[PDB]
């Protein structure tokens, strides 16, 4: 062959889009759930 | 008068439970089982932020429930071993009365209405500073003075 | 194989946290003698 080899970061444009959507979606679920816990914790601390 | 039950463990009396309103009340830190076999079958839920466990009162014992209120006017109050004073936001009882194992006693109003459940106390010169678990409209609160030890 | 395992674990954490919040939210309202849980909280949030 007259060209160099490829690395792990070389991925088609179509394949990259699917990875972004999946990781972003799952991350949102953790982010929303985290905020509810913090709000409740402050109320217990202050009210006592 | 008839709302008081004993808690035993390994043949010794550790403390007491009381039936008030529509709920069964027991301090969380007291070990052992209840003398009445009927109550032993209930499932209890625990929260260490108030040292309190509660469960639902069965139907056939509803006639034994005490009356309660939330009003706390300044004055004198009575309990098993004598008289207690409420003033300045704290309960004070003369030294010498009380000892480990007396947890769960109620404190009564003039007409027999229950206002507080007592657990522990603090040692001072001529008076004793009591730690109490009370309630208010729609919530409960814990009052604990400095230096108190568990009873 | 590795990526699937990690992603599933993260989802489980989000569910697990929600049940913890609900327990602490409600318990103050049930130990009070003669108390009634408010309508809005009884049905929709902190059920």
Curated annotation (Swiss-Prot), chain B:
Locations listed in the record: Virion; Host cytoplasm; Host cell membrane; Host nucleus
Top-level lineage group: Viruses
Residues the record marks as site: Involved in dimerization of the capsid protein: 77, 110
Active-site residue numbers: 29 (charge relay system), 51 (charge relay system), 103 (charge relay system)
Residues annotated as signal peptide: none
Residue ranges, annotated region (Interaction with spike glycoprotein E2): 45-50
Region (Dimerization of the capsid protein): 73-83, 109-113
Motif window: Nuclear export signal: 34-44
Disulphide bonds in the chain: 3-18
Domain named Peptidase S3: residues: 3-151
Assembly mode: Homodimer. Homomultimer. Interacts with host karyopherin KPNA4; this interaction allows the nuclear import of the viral capsid protein. Interacts with spike glycoprotein E2. Interacts with host IRAK1; the interaction leads to inhibition of IRAK1-dependent signaling.
Role played: Forms an icosahedral capsid with a T=4 symmetry composed of 240 copies of the capsid protein surrounded by a lipid membrane through which penetrate 80 spikes composed of trimers of E1-E2 heterodimers. The capsid protein binds to the viral RNA genome at a site adjacent to a ribosome binding site for viral genome translation following genome release. Possesses a protease activity that results in its autocatalytic cleavage from the nascent structural protein.
Free-text domain note: The N-terminus contains a nuclear localization signal and a CRM1-mediated nuclear export signal. The C-terminus functions as a protease during translation to cleave itself from the translating structural polyprotein.
Protein name from the UniProt record: Capsid protein
Lineage: Viruses, Riboviria, Orthornavirae, Kitrinoviricota, Alsuviricetes
Residues represented out of the complete protein: 111 to 261 of 1248
